[PDB]
Amino acid sequence: RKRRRHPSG
Amino acid sequence: PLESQYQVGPLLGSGGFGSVYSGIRVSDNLPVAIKHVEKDRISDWGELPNGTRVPMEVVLLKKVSSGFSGVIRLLDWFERPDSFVLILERPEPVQDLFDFITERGALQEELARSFFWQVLEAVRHCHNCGVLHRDIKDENILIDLNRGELKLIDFGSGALLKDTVYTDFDGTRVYSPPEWIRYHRYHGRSAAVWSLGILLYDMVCGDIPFEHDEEIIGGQVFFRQRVSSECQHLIRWCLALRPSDRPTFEEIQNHPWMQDVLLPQETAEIHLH
Structure with missing residues (x-):
């Protein structure tokens, strides 16, 4: 299962 | 110069x-x-x-x-x-908590407890100083691997702390609370507590619980790893849909799952060295 960062915006 | x-x-x-x-x-x-x-x-x-x-x-x-x-x-x-x-x-040496969790998977509850405690103390310090971070997430937490100490970074979405409603937000949406998703309104402390629930789930399950708006506002928390009943209860309490139903910082740190935290030095020796 894909784990990803999430940009702050 | x-x-x-x-x-x-x-x-x-x-x-x-x-x-x-x-x-x-x-x-x-x-x-x-x-x-x-x-x-x-x-x-x-x-x-x-x-x-x-x-x-x-x-x-x-x-x-x-x-x-x-x-x-x-x-x-x-x-x-x-x-x-x-x-x-x-x-x-x-340093590693941010996002990369740490990516590499090691779901954290042992003893380690998640030590990290989560230190994050609570850092956020209490910010609020004591009149500052709302507004972007608590694993990417914005550095781990000092030798000392076992966590450090909050990136105040670029923050605000002065106030007791009235906030109607602007530029933090991370998947850590933002359902009242922001639904009404574009939130109060500072209860929104912070929501993001801390997201962060704790992240630590003990290996990834955040919600990716989509419908999941954030649906308020169903499925546990994909074995997590103790006491830890599940704390998470589900931080993630209460109604903001007034969420615990205060004092109630989080008095929660039975939070008792007997490791010292930072013990955390480094047991889990990081």
Whole structure:
């Protein structure tokens, strides 16, 4: 299962 | 002069927060991080206790950077024609909590408890100083791997703490609370507590619970790892749909899952060394 960062915006 | 006081090393990263370089203070070889923000990209401006007009990030960092704490401290700052430059602490060796969880998977509850406790103390420190971070997430937490100490970073979405409603938000949506998703309104402390529930789930399950707006507002928490009933209860309490149903910081730290936390040094020796 894909784990990803999430940009702050 | 900025360029004479510091030696600039590799780019550590860049994004919504600007561009951050590794650095060393020539005066004493102290490791620093050198963060550049373009003036054109700065949304919220503040005034330093002297009338100087600076990015809000500088105002907030100065409010929290007095004394020791679990916050990465601002050491100095410079204004350039088109940008501001911030000189920040750089612990070494360091890994941010996002990468740590990616590499090690779901954390043992004893380790998650130590990390979560330290994050609570850092956020309490910010709120004591009048500062709302508004972007608590594993990416914005550094781990000092030798000392076992966590440090909060990136106050670029923050605000002065207040007791009235907030109607603007530029933090991370998947950590934002359902009242922000539904009504574009939130209060500072209860929204912070929601993001802490997201963070705790992240630590004990290995990834955040919600990716989509419908999941955030649906308020169903499925546990994909074995998690103790006491820890599940704390998470589900932080993630209550109604903000007034969420615990205060005091109730979190008095929760039975939170008792008998490891010291930072023990945390490093048992889990990080």
